[PDB]
Design a protein around this ligand. Structure first.
Ligand code: TDC
Ligand code: TDC
Ligand code: MG
Ligand code: MG
Ligand code: MG
Ligand code: MG
Lengths: 200, 200
């Protein structure tokens, strides 16, 4: 199962999530398709394993530092999650709809516990963490897909742009989406603060 | 171009975004593939058109009501966007990375103008709108992909779950993701309020 992930990751960056086929993986592994099907129950199982391995390799801020604020942790954790998702073609797509793996239980429990220790209810701490995750996934996928489309997509017409949209597009072309992402992350954290403060 | 979208939408729900192929669309249209290629420059152009049409058909809260607060508008707009994305298989996937179409310019300009009239800078109003969009896309895609995986994905092991994760999973299995979504939306709006308030 170790080398299979490594080959599948290499294949996935070369052909994308859609092109990560049984035929093509079995070819890369040097084996008959029936053998690949035997040990890897299906594509969804493979994708699940890739989602875990991508965070294992590249998500380096999964735990709070000693004495770190929850605000700081959420920000650093989100930036790390983003960096991990961006490392591979369709990395964010691979993650979508997964649930924590057994190897991640201690990590995600620590995050949940950290929120409750800071005074969030489990439900609200979960919803905050979920909001950060969903926002980050959406921001990453929009960025990755926009970049991927540049080749196929006609230069969009500017002769009839209204003023604010015209300015907005200029702002968005000024970087890769990172500024927007950091601003949204801060909006979320400011929101969680308001909410937490009221309840306590 | 009208009937093509209609057939492609019907095909897309039956075979997904990946299965929306030239071969298969040309077959559904009753035409040779070279004819389909002629008028539809490529798949990305088709997907772009589908993204516009899906909102045209089902996104019914694109404009603020007379006298409506920006907080209320963002919430109602987000709920509507979600409802539209959820209507079709891979609707959220179709949207990813698109930019406003000429037919949408007046609509998105109105939204941007509404934020600036309420005291947001154009940049901050844009980043707020972008945050709502990214969060909604991420929440929808996670929900849709989780549901789609239920068939292929083994019943995940519960014998070694830690307490907070165990409770979190029970909370998440209690609905389809809507409660989490509404909570995250409120966190975002509370955050934007804090930010706007400080600046003014
Ligand atoms: C707590 C939790 C998390 C995630 C998650 O999917 C999830 C779930 O599906 C059900 C119940 C709880 C969770 C994350 O994916 C994950 O990305 C993650 O696995 C994770 C991780 N493994 O380190 C994180 O850093 C978290 N962060 C991005 C908010 C978040 C934590
Ligand atoms: C303003 C804006 C929007 C969107 C968008 O993609 C975008 C962009 O890519 C660049 C610059 C501005 C925008 C939306 O997709 C869209 O979904 C949308 O098209 C849209 C719409 N057409 O009605 C919306 O309702 C908006 N809402 C979900 C926040 C948002 C507005
Ligand atoms: Mg792709
Ligand atoms: Mg996850
Ligand atoms: Mg699918
Ligand atoms: Mg958009």
């Amino acid at each position: 199962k170790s080398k299979v992930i490594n080959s599948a990751l290499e294949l996935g960056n070369e052909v994308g999530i859609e092109g990560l086929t049984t035929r093509k993986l079995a070819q890369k592994l040097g084996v008959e398709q029936p053998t690949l099907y035997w040990h890897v129950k299906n594509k969804r199982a493979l994708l699940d394993a890739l989602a875990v391995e991508i965070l294992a390799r590249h998500h380096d801020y999964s735990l709070p530092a000693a004495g770190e604020s929850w605000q700081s942790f959420l920000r650093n954790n989100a930036m790390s999650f983003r960096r991990a998702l961006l490392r591979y073609r369709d990395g964010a797509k691979v993650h979508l709809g997964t649930r924590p793996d057994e190897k991640q239980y201690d990590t995600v429990e620590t995050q949940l516990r950290f929120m409750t220790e800071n005074g969030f209810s489990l439900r609200d701490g979960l919803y905050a963490i979920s909001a950060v995750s969903h926002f980050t996934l959406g921001a990453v996928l929009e960025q990755q897909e926009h970049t991927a489309a540049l080749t196929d997509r006609p230069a969009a017409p500017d002769e009839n742009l209204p003023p604010l949209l015209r300015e907005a597009l200029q702002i968005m072309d000024s970087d890769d989406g990172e500024q927007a992402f950091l601003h949204g992350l801060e909006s979320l954290i400011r929101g969680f603060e308001v909410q937490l403060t009221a309840l306590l």
